[PDB]
Amino acid sequence: MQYKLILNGKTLKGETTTEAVDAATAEKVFKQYFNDNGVDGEWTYDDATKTFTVTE
Amino acid sequence: MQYKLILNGKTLKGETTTEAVDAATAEKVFKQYFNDNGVDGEWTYDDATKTFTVTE
Numbered sequence: 001m002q003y004k005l006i007l008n009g010k011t012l013k014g015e016t017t018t019e020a021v022d023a024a025t026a027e028k029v030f031k032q033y034f035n036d037n038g039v040d041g042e043w044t045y046d047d048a049t050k051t052f053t054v055t056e
Numbered sequence: 057m058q059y060k061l062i063l064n065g066k067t068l069k070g071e072t073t074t075e076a077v078d079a080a081t082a083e084k085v086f087k088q089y090f091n092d093n094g095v096d097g098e099w100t101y102d103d104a105t106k107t108f109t110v111t112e
Binding site: 012017029 | 093
């Protein structure tokens with residue numbers, strides 16, 4: 001279903017939102033992006049509350 | 057001064073905001089990001105209205 005990206009950091013802050021096929025994909029996609037980008041913030045995943053938490 | 061990033065696309069949509077030293081830098085930075093991230097959306101720059109326009 002619809003997932004939501006929460007961004008926490010210093011050089012960047014904000015919230016994105018995407019809908020993937022499911023838990024395994026949205027998760028797969030947003031990871032693809034925030035695993036580096038000089039942020040590699042702390043990862044968090046929420047399935048049943050559609051959320052992500054990135055923390056530099 | 058304060059610049060603003062407008063995101064237009066399919067896999068991603070949203071708005072970010074950063075303050076750079078000036079027109080040459082904010083421009084330089086946001087370009088650094090949206091020139092490939094599978095989006096490489098159309099570029100647009102606004103100095104006097106602090107804005108950017110990305111379009112897949």
